[PDB]
């Protein structure tokens, strides 16, 4: 559980926002993996399943995140 505190201190340092949400998301992701242990699923495929989901998530966030400069806007009208 100290790891959740260690990543929270780095969340407030390198970023400064989402210190509480990063621990809840890591804890809820831990809660979703609880029935996986009771069924006998090893942790290797559990790690590779989430690492692939995050890889597909970052690619989707870049599509969801809108950063525009010369496209139908300028450095002013956007703000």
């Amino acid at each position: 559980a100290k790891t959740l505190v260690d990543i929270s201190r780095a969340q407030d340092a390198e970023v400064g926002d989402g210190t509480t949400s990063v621990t809840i998301l890591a804890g809820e992701l831990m809660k979703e993996a609880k029935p996986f242990l009771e069924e006998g699923i090893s942790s290797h495929l559990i790690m590779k399943g989430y690492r692939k989901a995050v890889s597909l998530a970052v690619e989707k966030i870049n599509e969801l995140a809108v950063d525009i400069t010369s496209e139908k806007s300028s450095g002013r009208e956007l703000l």
Partner: protein, 543 residues
Amino acid sequence: QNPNAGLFKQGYNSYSNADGQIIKSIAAIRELHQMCLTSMGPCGRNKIIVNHLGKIIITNDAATMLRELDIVHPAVKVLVMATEQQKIDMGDGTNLVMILAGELLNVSEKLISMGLSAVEIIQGYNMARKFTLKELDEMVVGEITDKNDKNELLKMIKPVISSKKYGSEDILSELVSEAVSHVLPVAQQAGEIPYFNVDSIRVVKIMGGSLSNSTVIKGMVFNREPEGHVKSLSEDKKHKVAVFTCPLDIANTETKGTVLLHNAQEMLDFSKGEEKQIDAMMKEIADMGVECIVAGAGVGELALHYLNRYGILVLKVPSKFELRRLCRVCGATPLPRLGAPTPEELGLVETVKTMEIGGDRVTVFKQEQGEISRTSTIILRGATQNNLDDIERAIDDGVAAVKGLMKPSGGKLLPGAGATEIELISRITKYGERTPGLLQLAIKQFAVAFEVVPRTLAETAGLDVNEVLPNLYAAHNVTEPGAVKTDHLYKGVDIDGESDEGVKDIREENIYDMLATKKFAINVATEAATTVLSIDQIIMAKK
């Protein structure tokens, strides 16, 4: 009222074979055997251990973990002492020695319960060990030419980083192999004089950045401040460096010599005396061409003022271990006195500068061409402190792997990733039916004990034991329509992680195991299990 028979000594602990202590001793090792089963392999993980002093040590290496764990049963201490044999000599394979020695006791448990004598169990492993040593010479596929090329080092270093830290093996291999090529001179076909040591590669770390932004320095890297208004020296060639054990201050008497002021008359004489004496000693050093002074002891206030006017870089290294590696680069030597820069004892550095790497400005120590350095340092960067400390322990295992390139069978290699342990099964069982007598029981079980390596890699990877395991036996055992066996000898054990059917070939990823490391690990694991099986009684006393 109820007496006790069998103990004539004292109320201390007496462990005899009558109650099956030889099984209980293995059961105590089995508790720590599964500990190493969660270590070896890319699915392994570091263990968090809090020292009695309130210090947290995090490392993936199991041999380092054994030093941080309190061992109770002395039978485990025999395996710990045997584990240090693998860490001190070859520096790699500690997971192969401990897990195999624990499995050699597991397969021997079936022989003890069957009624086979423990003496014939030891005699069977001694005959099976000599049969294995003869096969390891004929199982060599490729051989390292010892070219010391950067591309040739990436072949050996990649599997060493593997089964420790996964996914960074492509980035870390370029960082480790670059520092190895810096400390190795230019030579070929000469094994008389050793060159590469275990201290030639220093590992430093800093918070921030990533592994892709890390670089490799050809010399020692210092993370401290220059301690003066001079940030760095010039680019001129062959700067002189002087190492001083005496602190920087006015020359005093070796015995006592405490400065005291009786009256104001002695105040102006002793204050100006420290100003004239230090300036006279620092001027003679700067006139000889020495632009850098290494002070092992403390530095006075008036000393830093005169070094800034002469443009001399200030460096303080209190650690004597860092001074030893400093002498191997420039050639400087610590002088017991102050103010006598003898040119024979001085060193020469090509380039010394203060650059900002990782967010903080550090003063490094490196070279260019001349005065070739035998010591290098790798700068690590990353946003995760837990994974950063694990890489520091993983590089140290890679440094010892480069040392295994020396005369004792350094070039020869065997296919790894479970391909070696499974192939030994068919070769030992071939000699089982060849050797008549009661030795067939221990020889066959000696080959079955090698099944723990492929089973552990398949179990920790989430693969079904009932699926991959029968495919591993069919991979190394095939029926070829001919006298000469052919096709795939490269089929190993695959960790998967994405998807696959069956197994994969070792020739694709070029994951190989050194002969000197594997051959030495078998002899240690055999003698370690020999000691445990030979002990039928253990006598202990309470502390």
